Structures are given as C-alpha cells and as structure tokens.
Ligand SMILES: CC(=O)N[C@@H]1[C@@H](O)[C@H](O[C@@H]2O[C@H](CO)[C@H](O)[C@H](O)[C@H]2O)[C@@H](CO)O[C@H]1O
C-alpha cells in the first residue's frame with residue numbers, strides 16, 4: 001500500500017463475452033487472459049450506463065444515472081463553427097455535456113491525496129472550453145480525444161493534449177500533420193498514416209516511463225478500441241484474422257457517423273480487440289520493468305456492452321454468450337462488462353468474484369484503497385441541497401477479505417431506448433417506455449421470460465427503488481412507471 005499506484009484501463013464498447021477469459025471463442029486475448037490468471041475476474045460487475053458518456057460520468061462522479069449530471073450522449077459540436085485542416089472541414093469546438101463543476105470527480109480526490117494523474121484516450125466529460133475539461137478537473141497529463149464523435153475516426157485531423165510537463169495553459173489541439181493531407185472519408189482515407197490508438201498508447205507509455213517509486217500515480221487509460229470505426233493498421237494482427245475468418249462481411253460506410261467503409265469486418269473487430277490486448281501486455285510489462293508491479297493495482301474494464309456499429313457483428317462474436325442485448329439496452333448485455341483486477345500479493349490470484357457492483361462504486365473503492373477515510377464528509381459540496389454519492393466500496397472483496405457490504409439495488413436509466421434497469425439480487429427489472437418487465441437472473445440469465453405478472457410485490461418493491469433513486473434532469477428524460 002503506502003499509497004499504491006492505480007491504473008484503470010477502461011476500453012470502449014467491449015461486451016462481457018468479447019474476451020477469451022469470459023468465453024470468447026474467436027479472438028485471442030492472451031495478455032488479459034494471463035492478467036485474469038494472476039488476478040480476480042468479476043462476473044457481476046456493471047457499467048454506469050449502457051452508453052459511453054454517462055457510464056464514464058458514473059465512474060468519475062461516484063453517482064448512478066438517477067442522480068448524475070450526465071445520463072446520455074449530448075453533443076455540443078453540432079452548430080460549432082468550421083476550421084479547415086488542409087481541404088478537410090472540421091468542428092472548431094468538439095465534445096459532450098460537461099460534468100457538474102460543483103461535484104467532485106475521482107482524479108480530484110487522487111490529486112488531494114498527493115497523486116500525479118494521467119489520462120490517455122477519450123475524455124467525453126465536457127467540450128473544449130467548458131467547465132469540465134481534464135486540465136480543470138484534476139488531470140496533470142492528458143492526451144487523446146476530448147470528443148466521443150471525433151473518436152469515430154482512428155485517423156483523425158487532430159488529437160487533444162493538456163500536459164503540465166509541456167506548460168500547456170489548457171487543452172490544445174495537436175494536428176495530425178500527415179492525416180490532414182487526405183480526406184476524412186472514401187478510397188483515400190486509408191492513406192492517412194497517423195493511427196490514434198497507437199499514438200495514444202505511445203503517449204500513455206511515455207507518461208508511465210516518467211513514473212518512479214516516489215510519487216504515487218493514478219492513470220486512466222480510456223483507449224477507444226474496439227469502438228467503431230472498424231479501421232486500423234493493415235498489419236500482422238489484422239492479417240492473422242483475415243486468414244482465419246472466411247468468408248467475412250463488409251461495411252458500406254456512414255460519412256455522417258465518421259465510420260469509414262471497410263472490408264473483412266470480423267477480421268477488423270477481432271484485430272481491434274487483439275491489438276488492445278497487446279497494449280495491455282505492454283502496460284503490464286512496463287510496470288515489471290520499472291519495479292512497480294507489487295505497488296500497482298491494474299483494473300481492465302469496458303464502459304458498456306457490445307456494439308453493432310461500423311460493421312461490428314455481435315451476433316457472430318456472441319455465439320457462445322449468455323447475456324441478452326447490446327449497448328443502449330438495460331438488458332444484462334448492455335450493462336454487464338468485463339472487469340479484471342490484478343495487484344500481485346494483494347488481490348488473490350486466479351479468482352472469480354461474483355460481488356454485484358457498478359462503476360459508481362469505484363470512487364469509494366479507490367478512496368478505501370488509498371486510506372482516504374470519510375470521503376463523503378470531505379468531498380461533498382455543502383452549498384448543494386443534496387450532493388449524491390451512490391457507491392459502496394468493494395475494496396474488501398477485491399483484497400479477498402471481510403466486511404464486504406452489499407447493495408440493496410443497482411440502478412440505471414437511459415433516454416435513447418427510454419429504459420430503467422434495477423437489479424436486486426437474483427431479480428432484474430427492465431422498464432421499457434414506462435412498462436416494467438421482470439426477470440430472474442438465476443433461472444433466466446438471458447432475460448427471455450418476463451415474469452412481472454407472477455411477482456406483483458417484487459415489481460412494486462423495485463418500482464419503489466426507481467421512485468426513490470430517480471431525480472429530474474432537464475437534459476436527459478426517461479418515462480417512469482405508473483405509481
Ligand atoms: C449527429 C450524430 O449524433 N451522429 C450520430 C453518431 O454520433 C452516432 O454514433 C454515436 O456517437 C456518439 C457521440 O457522442 C457516441 O460516440 C456513441 O458511442 C456512438 O454510437 C451514430 C449511431 O450509430 O449515428 C449518427 O447519426
């Protein structure tokens with residue numbers, strides 16, 4: 001301990017069944033499988049939300065989406081002025097709805113505990129010049145995509161940086177000086193040579209290189225893989241899967257979505273996950289090389305369930321999977337995610353953990369690990385009517401030990417599919433357009449058999465949770481069930 005280092009590798013749109021160690025049959029994930037072998041594989045860990053921005057917001061704020069300022073994907077670039085990068089028209093302001101500036105986020109707690117903070121990849125927590133950019137919210141070294149929409153292109157016009165070390169005064173843009181010579185869409189797009197996932201990992205690894213045993217570090221590696229578009233370097237990883245998958249399918253492109261057309265989509269998606277796995281192997285190798293392995297907790301997870309964008313084929317990859325649904329659904333497949341922890345000599349090796357937990361638990365979990373006691377009394381905003389903190393530390397079960405507290409419920413709400421999810425032990429409610437559906441995850445893991453009619457008292461108990469946990473948010477609307 002003595003303030004352990006923490007790396008949180010949070011990937012983008014990877015399903016529960018997309019890793020080898022969670023049963024994926026078609027994709028090699030040797031480094032994450034070995035991480036699991038040496039660590040703890042969580043079987044009932046959940047995203048903050050079935051989509052990116054609120055799931056990441058839940059992790060950052062320690063709040064469920066009945067309370068969180070961010071409960072959906074909200075764009076601030078739609079009406080932004082245009083800037084030219086070569087012949088390419090680009091938005092002059094990018095990004096999503098900002099985190100509440102009056103509610104603490106995890107990096108700020110780590111800064112108050114004497115940590116240095118890094119974040120490499122997707123921010124998705126406020127647009128350029130907003131009150132919630134990484135510079136303003138406790139990140140010392142940031143490199144990647146401020147904007148989730150920008151992140152659709154793996155060969156973008158620019159990336160974003162805030163580097164204390166370089167004396168940046170705020171977030172800046174780093175132009176991809178080779179990429180902007182070519183179009184953003186069509187036959188010449190793949191002439192772009194500056195691949196963001198490699199560049200962002202290289203910046204993360206340069207940052208990890210600078211760390212030593214002295215000052216504790218907190219790194220958030222929000223790598224965009226395997227989020228669409230399904231375009232990557234045409235290298236030995238991709239070619240392995242072009243050889244393996246036969247026949248394969250293709251994707252015609254969506255210029256409006258910034259998803260380029262591509263061929264061999266099974267090979268592209270498998271390649272993206274094996275590429276990400278190789279990045280994780282490089283992180284773990286670096287910690288060992290620097291003598292930091294025994295004092296660093298590494299967690300790998302995904303922000304939400306599997307996707308069907310840019311040529312992704314979750315039906316194909318889901319052949320052996322147990323959970324129903326995709327990204328944007330409050331069915332188990334939208335919200336239950338891979339979650340692997342490794343901390344040699346602290347987290348018991350080769351374990352499975354069934355503890356029911358969600359991303360809003362990470363804030364109290366980390367606070368417990370770093371010895372930050374009574375974090376709510378310390379960080380709660382006294383100027384608010386009420387400052388919500390929804391998490392329960394799972395530091396005890398992570399460290400194999402006693403006094404592990406249990407949630408009465410987990411809670412999700414999501415505007416685009418108009419859904420509310422509640423999990424109370426074996427019981428799972430999905431509200432769809434205000435109508436409750438009820439499933440037993442012990443007898444019906446795939447949520448095939450709506451049994452609301454057989455359990456009216458359970459339906460009322462779980463609706464009571466919704467009525468108690470949902471507070472109004474003027475930006476993100478869901479239909480509550482009838483009272
Ligand atoms: C104009 C518009 O919103 N375009 C959408 C795409 O954004 C959308 O993709 C989603 O983009 C959001 C951006 O915050 C986020 O990256 C999601 O993960 C992603 O799915 C796409 C839906 O497939 O449709 C376009 O019309």
Ligand SMILES: [Ca+2]
Nearest residue numbers: 012013052303
């Ligand atoms: Ca995502």
